[PDB]
Symmetry: D4
Subunit: 190 residues, 8 copies
């Protein structure tokens, strides 16, 4: 996995999709904006679009909010944008290996640059466990609070600037991977 980690990204990736549009895949808000600026300076906007993981997750969610309001899931990962990876909750997953490839397909329809949309069932306890572990790695005390549709980790203790900062970065780290759909975090007020 030396490879995978020292693996070197191309900053933008231009991906013709099934609708004749070229998609340009960016890695963060800043690059999105910039590329989105190039497209307008060159009259490409009728022919290309800029995408990133965060915006597509939001878009997909919006759709899911309507046609799958019941679905129990985490996030979509676009490391390989030609095969997005959709993380679903195994323990609350209520669909036949039929219906899941119906889901897959419908998401494919939403993403013209996707060749296939991979579905992957994730473990509800793995989600929550890794939140806990991370909290210890970054040395923040906490208390866990189960509830109806998830788990809350109320980060506690007195908290310095730095101690506020580190917790903020970790929470974004965790959110980048898991979303805030199962686990949410919160700071306690003393």
């Amino acid at each position: 996995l030396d490879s995978l980690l020292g693996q070197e990204k191309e900053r933008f990736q231009v991906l013709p999709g099934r609708d004749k549009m070229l998609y340009v895949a960016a890695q963060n808000e800043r690059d999105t904006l910039w590329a989105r600026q190039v497209l307008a300076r060159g009259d490409y906007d009728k022919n290309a679009r800029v995408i990133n993981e965060n915006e597509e997750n939001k878009r997909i969610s919006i759709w899911l909010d309507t046609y799958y309001p019941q679905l129990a899931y985490y996030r979509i990962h676009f490391d390989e944008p030609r095969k997005p990876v959709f993380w679903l909750s195994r323990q609350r997953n209520t669909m036949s290996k039929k219906e899941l490839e119906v889901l897959s397909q419908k998401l494919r329809a939403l993403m013209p640059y996707a060749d296939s949309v991979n579905i992957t069932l994730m473990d509800d306890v793995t989600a929550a466990g890794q939140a806990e572990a991370g909290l210890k790695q970054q040395a923040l005390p906490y208390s866990r609070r189960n509830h109806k549709g998830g788990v809350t980790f109320v980060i506690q203790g007195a908290l310095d600037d730095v101690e506020i900062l580190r917790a903020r970065q970790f929470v974004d780290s965790y959110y980048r991977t898991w979303g805030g759909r199962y686990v949410q975090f919160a700071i306690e007020l003393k």
Copy 2:
């Protein structure tokens, strides 16, 4: 109704100076800053050896330390010092395990603990009233929240996209609630989005 006007008035003297069973003088300041000022005064007129300055926050700390040792199980809230010579102590009704008799002993132990107090009133407060008032206060304040009951007590997770001006308000309410109730049963947390 006339009582209200009294409770609610610019009448009270600034500081209030209590004689103590321990032959020390207690001066009751109303807040941190006033306390610091009193402390300064004593130091200048050399009373620091005969008089002591107190306030609600500090005394609650001290009573708490003590209680950690002598009543480590007590389900309680806060001691109020509106009348510093008759502190009023709020315990949970629902979670109170003592007898009518055990409580007067408490009252007395606390009386002893507070050499300036004449008595130490004890009022069993209603756990439901406590969370009720947190909830009503959040609504009063248009601050959306989610209620999570737990083992210790209740955590109100404050939610929503959070404005600057709406953060400061939340902090301010939460302080208000703690002053009255303490933090031992109800907790407030702000959710990270």
Copy 3:
């Protein structure tokens, strides 16, 4: 002259306790700080079941909500509680669609909604005065701006580059403005350069 001399030099009372037509006591505070502190006092002494705290901003909100349901098409500004027993309600002349008949009827429901209010005094205000006052105050403070009409009312885009103070004084003026007029007509915005 002297009429004014007093109005300005008045020593408004910090809290005013007012029995209402629903038997409850109503304590009227000048701002959110006093509201919290009062709301505190009522908690400590078991008034909470008997009395309530009110303030201009909160009441304006609560009443907005009720009007949202039973008068959703109503064009108004804000409610002034300088005299809480007689709260003045500023309505728009120019967008008024109601007989002297229909008025007083509203006046009476609003009266219900405010047990402390003996009577609610509706007053017809001039859309031109509303806008004209923003226009003037903006010059007094020396803030360049541009007017943009809409459905709803007016948006005053505050223009020009802006100091930390040019920003501040502007934030203040606007607070003063909204205190008087609400933000349902005239809007304020800071332009981005």
Copy 4:
């Protein structure tokens, strides 16, 4: 054959600075932003080039040409000039508000060519006001900001509404710089509403 075009436009192999010779026997070094500009300006100072070399960036050149248009074309409805190719600046004028004629517009082109010693030419392209405002809205949405549009004399304003988180504000700030770099501020404006 575009896509290979996109590819080269998003290329990062493009040289930081670019030295261009001008008809005025001065050398123009095109920097890409304020920091680089200040860097090159510093390099020139130290090695005594300040007299025969000059640094330019799109922001500064947009101000100088604007001062110029203030005097010679004081009623021109335009947007901004782009310097992605400093040898061939492109200048966006509005179609719907352009009062000039084909040949008149080639005059303009010539005078700007003259005003920019280092340019081979100056491309004028007419732009659709509807596109300008359309792009403001779409990006405002892509950025998940609630807003109210306001038409007026010199174009359109977008009043940015909502209670606005700290991070939501910086998000709006960033997008608006972005919008301005492309379209300038002369037609579309953005404001943050005070609540």
Copy 5:
């Protein structure tokens, strides 16, 4: 008999606001600062006095008279007008730079009296430029700030030097507002040096 004078000048029994009638059949309410002004302005609005009453404060009146002097006395070397007694504004002109004559200065007085409907009179006092600059230095020292003086055309600048602590900066800010309220900014300036 002064000291009893000092005593009454430092008195805190003085009424917050002051209503004064003007020759223009408007009423001027003199507030003492921006906040009070905004308060009274709010009280007037609510009780419909906006048409016959107006709020004034020394800062706003100094700007209005300055606009006026820009046109009618555009070379006058002056400082500020003081409104400790709104019925008798005092106006500090420089002695050493005053070109006017005794009677000329009573003209000025009359025109300002006219421009300020609510004043019984307008006291002109000539002031010593050396005093102005002298007071800048002394207070700069009392405030324990290192500085360099710079003479120039329109007076004197005081460049505030030193590495400056956060609290030392706010200290300088405060003292300079203070200096400005009394002497205005038209002669003495203050700058913070960049290191």
Copy 6:
């Protein structure tokens, strides 16, 4: 001492002094400035001066720096400005009840509004003890560090905003009374 504490101050005090000048005694920087502004609007500056405890301490120090460079002392208190109270270090005080009234007198000369200048010998251990006690009242952990000409209280621990703030106010409280001539405080850097 109910009196003494609910005792109500006059904001400014006008005190004719032995040099024919009127001194106006203010309680803080802000009031100083304002009164110092009144004096200039009324041409009193040739006849009055504004004073406060902080500026006079600084002035006196400057003098002491020259004629008593050896002196071991804390601060001067001007609660009663007609009798300033000078706190000296008993344990490092090396002067005869003669020389002390010579000191007193010389300070009197510096302060025309002073009728007499009171000297009061304070206890080196009282200074330092009260620093320690205060640190506990305000619940800040610390370590004490003796040295050549004093004592340092390195406030330690992780420190919140609030926890930074409270320590700052207390340190000013203590300094108002004792000066930073014997005890200095410091925050540790983690």
Copy 7:
């Protein structure tokens, strides 16, 4: 002299992936942010059960906890991981009480504690060098200070009127010094004026 160029170079790969005696993979990130990124990667490609991410700061915490229990008296400084597979551990010479033999055991215990390490070098560093370099670094940085020796070690009280830009520099140096030396022998504090 050629060695310098190596130490000092943009050569090194980003992460470095070590096989461990415990049949887990160790990835060595160089800083917090890189660590967080690695952690993210593993989570996505599901290696979180077979590979672990490490860095100098975290490992020093862990070794410290351990040592608190098994060598509670040790006078030491910090472990460096420039070569993650040969950690170098710095102990005090002056305050070292162990024999040549006791130290190799240590080395070994630590070796065991670090399943990815090949060896664990031990270098006795000079207490004087340690404070020397703090002092030289403060001068290097024109940041006036006062040196206070104590029981634990040495506190350099940073002094003088303190600029904003000079605070940030001080913090930055102090971080630099801790990275190399830790905080166990030399401490920095900022004096309050």
Copy 8:
């Protein structure tokens, strides 16, 4: 043209290790961040006895100090180390009081002071160019200002009201300026309104 093309597109080396005439190695860093990190590296590997880190700003300070003693009346700007083996020293033509003879002598002492320097190249700079460059850069950035001469040199009081950005860009420009010229002649100040 091409001369420039390169100068600008150069890939300056991050650290340059340079043996000196005193046998020590000198590592030359571009800025304070790299200096710290390097200074770190030298600590870890026992170079500290052999090598040193230098940077333009620090060296400028150190050399200022030496000049303070043995040339206290010298009118100069700053030392440029773009090529450290040949550091250029900008002196003032207009205030030069020295023969070609006396120069080279200085050149040689400076050479001593910098074991890494093969030769120190003195260069006579134009007081008018010094000032004129501040004048120009100030317009480029669009910052209103006023000039005030003195004993010493020029103070450019930056005038006009100021955004958080008008402030910033101004703080930057000035840094760029001082990088090139030092602050011994031209001064910069922000006017207070």
